[PDB]
From Swiss-Prot, chains A, B:
Location within or outside the cell: Nucleus; Chromosome
Organism: Homo sapiens (Human)
Function comment: Key component of the super elongation complex (SEC), a complex required to increase the catalytic rate of RNA polymerase II transcription by suppressing transient pausing by the polymerase at multiple sites along the DNA. In the SEC complex, AFF4 acts as a central scaffold that recruits other factors through direct interactions with ELL proteins (ELL, ELL2 or ELL3) and the P-TEFb complex. In case of infection by HIV-1 virus, the SEC complex is recruited by the viral Tat protein to stimulate viral gene expression.
Name the UniProt record assigns to this protein: AF4/FMR2 family member 4
Disease note: A chromosomal aberration involving AFF4 is found in acute lymphoblastic leukemia (ALL). Insertion ins(5;11)(q31;q13q23) that forms a KMT2A/MLL1-AFF4 fusion protein. CHOPS syndrome: A syndrome characterized by cognitive impairment, coarse facies, heart defects, obesity, pulmonary involvement, short stature, and skeletal dysplasia.
Domain of life: Eukaryota
Signal peptide: none
Similarity-based family: Belongs to the AF4 family.
Length: 224, 224
């Protein structure tokens, strides 16, 4: 097919503009019957939800916005890629979802990574001291520990923030592996848009990459 | 200056070959008097230590090897970049050290990332349950927690593994920021070698990039 590259608007709108545009696209997805046509419009809306979250950061928290669209991405992928009847378009659509989900998880981590590095040093120091203080020393030789409530909650949130990265790495490798089955399609998309970089591509780079991919999918799916 | 690109040997030697070559270069660094000439040879040895660690992975653990050369990288940077008399070569040498330290930290994380994702789910589940079980419920309304020793040590190691990534991200951004002060030098190095990718560049890619950079530094420093 003849490939065309989207011309992207340089205007930066407000979060409400993108949020209202995201809701209209999701409503279009809800009305549709076909799972692929639904999933395309769901990912289209997902891109607009990401734009609204990015608008929040450019204005002055995007964390709830990004978390809730991660949830929508998960629901979106359940519409189709592991199925035996899964088509090459389903796999391509899944790769685009995985790229968004991965980079969104990485953003969720980065928004609270200042907390993570402090907590890491404090937790490491307090865990070694609470373990030593719980175990009675035995001269001539050298089951439940108690910790402060503050250290407990610091541990809980530290696990939560670092988990977001753990998911970002795993989902990124998953996208990297699955694209091997559609190497030609995504080598072309990478050629036109430049490839997404895990630690370097900003939300706008991701938004345009995904929309350009959706453009080609609708062209192959003969949709509007 | 006229830039030349190193021709890299395609032979893959054993860990002992690279380890013995790394020790000889470090001994050369120890004998030298000049801090810059020492630091160049220290980073040269660091590259060979990395090659020995990579040889261990290609053979069949590289974790001690990589951790100990991270330590050598830290000592190496203390020889010079924040100093007021710091030259453009010191800053360039520091960027190369930071690239190695960052990617080595990321490798240290990746070697034990299977433990991290399991521990994340278990810790999250057990922390919420131990916190609820410690706090007495109060009908009509809806300081130190105790945890098993196994959950304690699982938390301790989970912090240790995820920390390695926290350092990798922070040191990578530090390298990214500092190269802005030497944008021309590293735009050229990136052009000849291809740019290092945080989550994608393997150890061999990093080894050659660093050695190519050291080549240019010795050329500008008029050293052998």
């Amino acid at each position: 097919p003849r490939r065309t590259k989207l011309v992207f608007d340089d205007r930066n709108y407000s979060a409400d503009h993108y949020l209202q545009e995201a809701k209209k696209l999701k409503h279009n997805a809800d009305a549709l019957s076909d799972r692929f046509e639904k999933a395309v419009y769901y990912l289209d809306a997902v891109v607009s939800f990401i734009e609204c979250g990015n608008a929040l950061e450019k204005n002055a928290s995007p964390f709830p916005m990004y978390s809730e669209t991660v949830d929508l991405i998960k629901y979106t992928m359940k519409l189709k890629y592991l199925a035996p009847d899964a088509t090459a378009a389903d796999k391509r659509l899944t790769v685009l979802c995985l790229r968004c989900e991965s980079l969104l998880y990485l953003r969720l981590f980065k928004l609270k990574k200042e907390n993570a590095l402090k907590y890491s040093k404090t937790l490491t120091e307090h865990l070694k001291n609470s373990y030593n203080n719980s175990q009675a020393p035995s001269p001539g030789l050298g089951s439940s520990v108690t910790i402060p409530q503050k250290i407990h909650q610091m541990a809980a949130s530290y696990v939560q923030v670092t988990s977001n990265f753990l998911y970002a790495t795993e989902i990124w490798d998953q996208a990297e592996q699955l694209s091997k089955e559609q190497k030609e399609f995504f080598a072309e998309l990478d050629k036109v848009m430049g490839p997404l970089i895990f630690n370097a591509s900003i939300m706008t780079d991701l938004v345009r990459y995904t929309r350009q991919g959706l453009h080609w999918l609708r062209q192959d799916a003969k949709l509007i």
